[PDB]
Amino acid sequence: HCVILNDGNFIPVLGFGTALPLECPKSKAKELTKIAIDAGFHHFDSASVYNTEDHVGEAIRSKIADGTVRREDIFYTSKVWCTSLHPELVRASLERSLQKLQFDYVDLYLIHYPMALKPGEENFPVDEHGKLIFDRVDLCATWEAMEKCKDAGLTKSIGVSNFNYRQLEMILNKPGLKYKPVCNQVECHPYLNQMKLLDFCKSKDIVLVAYGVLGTGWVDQNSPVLLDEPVLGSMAKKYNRTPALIALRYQLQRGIVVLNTSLKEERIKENMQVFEFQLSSEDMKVLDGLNRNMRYIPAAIFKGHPNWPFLDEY
Amino acid sequence: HCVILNDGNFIPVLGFGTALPLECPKSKAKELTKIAIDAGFHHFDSASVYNTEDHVGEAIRSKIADGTVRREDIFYTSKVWCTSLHPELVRASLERSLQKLQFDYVDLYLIHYPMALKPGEENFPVDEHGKLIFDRVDLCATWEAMEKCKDAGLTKSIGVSNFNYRQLEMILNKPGLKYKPVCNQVECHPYLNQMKLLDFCKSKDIVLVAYGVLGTQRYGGWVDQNSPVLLDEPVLGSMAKKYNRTPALIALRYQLQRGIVVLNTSLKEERIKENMQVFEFQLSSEDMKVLDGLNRNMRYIPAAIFKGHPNWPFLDEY
């Protein structure tokens, strides 16, 4: 099951992300990758900052050798980090990724955040007081750097992540614009259905790829989470499905491309089930009523940045 | 190595926390307890809300049965959750606990947080909008319930956890006070040395028990997790090389020489052992004030779900 980006390319509605817990060995990514592939996953979401590329790349390659899948049956997304938003550093970043993955190209390249930091190896440069050392950049300048990457054939498509209405407009209403972003990858779940941004994105032919659709110290990790919501728990029993699926399907029927991950092979398989059922129109209106502007990933570490995308209503 | 509490009792300066990562089956705790026991640990920090007591109590009893340790050689701590802060519930919890652990008594009982929630089985009662159902309670009335638990012999010592200046004052300056809290168990580490709260507690014969002394980088998603991490702190990493010790160890040593009781844990037996090494070295006076200069008000455990509560302890400077 796919959908089609405003650049004529197609993308799988269900994607397996590859960001790993701080603990887990980069190597773990590789194993989980394979698992997903054998589970039917063809869409892999990764980023240069995650530092799992080289592994996610190895895994994909491995399944290419034993012919379990063809390179053109795999949609691989990579993202450019904040420390490489300066035009001249955008392409060096994508090639570097490609080098680790040993791919000729990627199927999607995103600007990870509409914010920039001091260029350098350290993905998180900081001062003597421990504060992230920001940096200003002409994003429209960065977007051109991306368009060229698409023209250079390094990526079949390009887009953005964690961009807000204005920031998206800032690019759309760009003088000279050649390619519009095919998507805005943002957190979106029943407690943050991102409708206002979703409809803006729809009225521009841009696809909203969702992450944090299930919500990722003792008290906080044991505080009621998203998949605890009774509006789900019950509705889950209704369809004899698990709440996480109810959560998944909900994002799907909205025409939202949903990402997702797990370290448990038992759950990874379970997520393909999202195609085994539909939600009544009445239930969809019920989930639309759970929203409460609960942004689980605010990117706290950025707050004082000139471009924090989450200050605006959307 | 012990230290004495203002109630005449002694407490091990090094204890093991029995909290478990959301995943790990409640059972894991048992195994982990036994492990640490066989590594020299005698102080075990626990709490009702963790639901690891019956397991932690099974490990201690098992080790008592095979003559590896005697009961009186184990300093066990429990805390009363937010949902049982009403005077008429405090003792019910403590007994509930003793039942699962199968202990005649606990060595220390603390008020887990200065905030209360809707009495009930759910430790995190919420409304139809996902918000926690707060509830007001007269802390002093609770402390009176805490004192009676002492006299009833159910606990040897009593204290508070995650209290700030004012909240401690509000207990100390309590008319008719019988037993001052023996300690204030808070989060404390090189990036949050709690110094101002530390001195106040000392000037009041209240010991300070530090948890999260190494870096949980919790609360927040993957993004925030990457932010500058402690064990990577150069000032520590270097200093560690200077004594041929691990950074975490420099961190545990730093808290000890300040008269602080430290809690710590791990799921790696290799690390649980390595911890005893905190007693094999000393940090020079100079190195001590170097680590003092690391502070940066970095609270990793804010108890975010409580922000809106009337008694959220982390708004005041301390």
Ligand SMILES: NC(=O)C1=CN([C@@H]2O[C@H](COP(=O)(O)OP(=O)(O)OC[C@H]3O[C@@H](n4cnc5c(N)ncnc54)[C@H](OP(=O)(O)O)[C@@H]3O)[C@@H](O)[C@H]2O)C=CC1
């Ligand atoms: N562009 C951006 O800004 C961001 C992109 N992402 C992308 O999204 C991917 C995943 O998103 P993430 O933020 O982790 O959040 P998710 O919404 O995927 O939820 C995270 C948690 O879901 C749990 N889970 C998975 N399957 C099930 C199930 N069937 N039932 C119950 N719980 C389940 C997992 O637990 P367990 O591991 O124990 O199974 C995991 O910790 C990343 O790897 C990345 O590619 C993420 C954040 C930001």
Ligand SMILES: NC(=O)C1=CN([C@@H]2O[C@H](COP(=O)(O)OP(=O)(O)OC[C@H]3O[C@@H](n4cnc5c(N)ncnc54)[C@H](OP(=O)(O)O)[C@@H]3O)[C@@H](O)[C@H]2O)C=CC1
């Ligand atoms: N009353 C309250 O409100 C609270 C009480 N607590 C108490 O404090 C206890 C411990 O505190 P906690 O917040 O967990 O924080 P800790 O500082 O104990 O962090 C625990 C982590 O330390 C890691 N670790 C242990 N030794 C080393 C080492 N030598 N080098 C590197 N990493 C190491 C472990 O990782 P790994 O497992 O990978 O080895 C483990 O996950 C709890 O179990 C609980 O009893 C905690 C929070 C709140």
